[PDB]
Amino acid sequence: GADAKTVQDTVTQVIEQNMNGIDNLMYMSSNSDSTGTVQITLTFESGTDADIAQVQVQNKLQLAMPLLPQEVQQQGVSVEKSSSSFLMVVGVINTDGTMTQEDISDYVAANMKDAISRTSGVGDVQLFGSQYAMRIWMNPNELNKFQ
C-alpha cells in the first residue's frame, strides 16, 4: 500500500544505517519500487565462501529489525543468496478450462511449493501465482446505511 517515498524513508534508511562492519563487502545497491518493495543487493569479493556472508548479513538485519514498522515485520523480511536468473520453469495447465487461474496457482502453491525445496541443489523457488487467501471485499453503502 505504500509508494517509493514511504518504503525508502521507513525501511531502507534504517537497514542502510545499521549495516556496518561486514568483512569483504565489495559493494551494494538498493532499489525501492512504487509497489511497496525494497531490494538490497550486497556483492562480495570473488572466492569468498557465501554462507558466512549470508549469516553476517542476517545478523545485521536482526540487529536492525526492531526499528522497522509493524506491517513489514508481519509480512516478513527475506535474506537469501542470489544466483542465475532461471534454471527451468514448469507450468501446470488444465484442458477443461472451467475454472480460473487462481485455483491452479493455489494448488501448485499448497501441494508443490513445500516438496520442490526438498531436493538438494535448489537455492530457492518463486511461484507465478498467489496462494489461496480469504478476502473480505467491503461495500461503503452498507457502512453508510448501518453506521
Partner: protein, 345 residues
C-alpha cells in the same frame, strides 16, 4: 496476446509454445511491464540458416516496430546471465551534498544532452531508469478533523484498509494456514471522485465525508529510486563506438565527469568496476611467461644462442591464425586465445 497470436500464426513451423507472463518485467516490476518466453521445435525439423534464433529475433523486431504505442524488444539469452556486453559500461551519478531529487535528474539530463554532442565516440548512451510519473497527493486538515471530532489514527487506518488492504490474521481451510485480507470493492477505488464516497464516524454519532476536511492535487514523482553505497544515485548505460576501444572512451568519460555541478560525483559499478580493478596485468603476464620460457629453454640446451632459434618461430604459426580469423570474420575471444596458445606450443 497479439505477440502470442503473431508467434503462433506467422511462425508455426519454428516456435512450439509461448509462455506469456504479465506483471514481472525486467526493467521494473509494475503494471506496465511484461515478458514472454518462446521455445522452438526440435532442431531436426529446422533446416537452413533462416531458422536460427538470430534469424528469428531480427525478423520479430522488424515486424514488431509497426506499433507506435508500446516498446517491444525481442532477443535471445546472453551466454552468461551474470555478466555481458563487455564493450559497454554502467556509469553512475552519486549525490554527495544532499541536494534533493529534481537537481539529480536535471544533472542527469544535462549530462545526457552534453554526451549527445559526441556521436563519433559514444553510441546508444541511454538511461535504464523510468522517468517521472504522475501521482495523487492528498492532504488531511488536522485542525478541521480535530474540530469535527475524528481521530487521525481512525482516518489513517480507514484509508489504508480501504484502498491499500490489510492483513488481519490466519485460519485453516483444509489443514493448512492461510491469510485473511480486508479490502474495498474494485468498482469503488478507480476514480478520484469517489474519494468523497467514504464516510467516517465521529464522537457524537455523526458521519462526515473525507472531502469535508481533505484536499488533493496531482504531483510528478519518481516511481523507482536507486541508492549506491548509501547515497542517492542514478545509473546510466552506454556503448562504445565501433572501431574504438573502451579505454579511449574512458578519458572522454572522465573529462565529462570533470565539468558537472558541485555535489554530483561519479562512480563505476558492475563489469566496469571489475575492469577498473583488474588493471593492466596481461602484458606483464606475457613478459613473465616469455622470460620463464627463455630460461627453461636455455636450461634444456646449453648455449645461450641456441634457444633463440626455437624462440623466434612464433610469428610463423601466428600468421595462420590471424589469416583464418580475418577470412572467416572471427573475434578475439578466449577460444581464439587458447588456440594461439596450443599452436605456439
Amino acid at each position: 496476446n497479439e505477440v502470442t497470436h503473431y508467434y503462433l500464426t506467422k511462425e508455426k513451423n519454428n516456435v512450439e509454445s509461448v509462455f506469456a507472463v504479465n506483471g514481472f518485467g525486467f526493467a521494473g516490476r509494475g503494471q506496465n511491464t511484461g515478458i514472454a518466453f518462446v521455445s522452438l521445435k526440435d532442431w531436426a525439423d529446422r533446416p537452413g540458416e533462416e531458422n536460427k534464433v538470430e534469424a528469428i529475433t531480427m525478423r520479430a523486431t522488424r515486424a514488431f516496430s509497426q506499433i507506435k504505442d508500446a516498446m517491444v524488444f525481442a532477443f535471445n539469452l546472453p551466454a552468461i546471465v551474470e555478466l555481458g556486453t563487455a564493450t559497454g559500461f554502467d556509469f553512475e551519478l552519486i549525490d554527495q551534498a544532499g541536494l534533493g531529487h529534481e537537481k539529480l535528474t536535471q544533472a542527469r539530463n544535462q549530462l545526457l544532452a552534453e554526451a549527445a554532442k559526441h556521436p563519433d565516440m559514444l553510441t546508444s548512451v541511454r538511461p535504464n531508469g523510468l522517468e517521472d510519473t504522475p501521482q495523487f497527493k492528498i492532504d488531511i486538515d488536522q485542525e478541521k478533523a480535530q474540530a469535527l471530532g475524528v481521530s487521525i489514527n481512525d482516518i489513517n487506518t480507514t484509508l489504508g484498509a480501504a484502498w491499500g488492504g490489510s492483513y488481519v490474521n490466519d485460519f485453516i481451510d483444509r489443514g493448512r494456514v492461510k491469510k485473511v485480507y480486508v479490502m474495498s470493492e474494485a468498482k469503488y477505488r478507480m476514480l478520484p471522485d469517489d474519494i468523497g464516497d467514504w464516510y467516517v464516524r465521529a464522537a457524537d454519532g455523526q458521519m462526515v465525508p473525507f472531502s469535508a476536511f481533505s484536499s488533493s492535487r496531482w504531483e510528478y514523482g519518481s516511481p523507482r529510486l536507486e541508492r549506491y553505497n548509501g547515497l542517492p544515485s542514478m545509473e546510466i548505460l552506454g556503448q562504445a563506438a565501433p572501431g574504438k576501444s573502451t579505454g579511449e572512451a574512458m578519458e572522454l568519460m572522465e573529462q565529462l565527469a570533470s565539468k558537472l555541478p558541485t555535489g554530483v560525483g561519479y562512480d563505476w559499478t558492475g563489469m566496469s568496476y571489475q575492469e577498473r580493478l583488474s588493471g593492466n596485468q596481461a602484458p606483464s603476464l606475457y613478459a613473465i611467461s616469455l622470460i620463464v620460457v627463455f630460461l627453461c629453454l636455455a636450461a634444456l640446451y646449453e648455449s645461450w644462442s641456441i634457444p633463440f632459434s626455437v624462440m623466434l618461430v612464433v610469428p610463423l604459426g601466428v600468421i595462420g591464425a590471424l589469416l583464418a580469423a580475418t577470412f572467416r570474420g572471427l573475434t578475439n575471444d578466449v577460444y581464439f586465445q587458447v588456440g594461439l596458445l596450443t599452436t605456439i606450443g
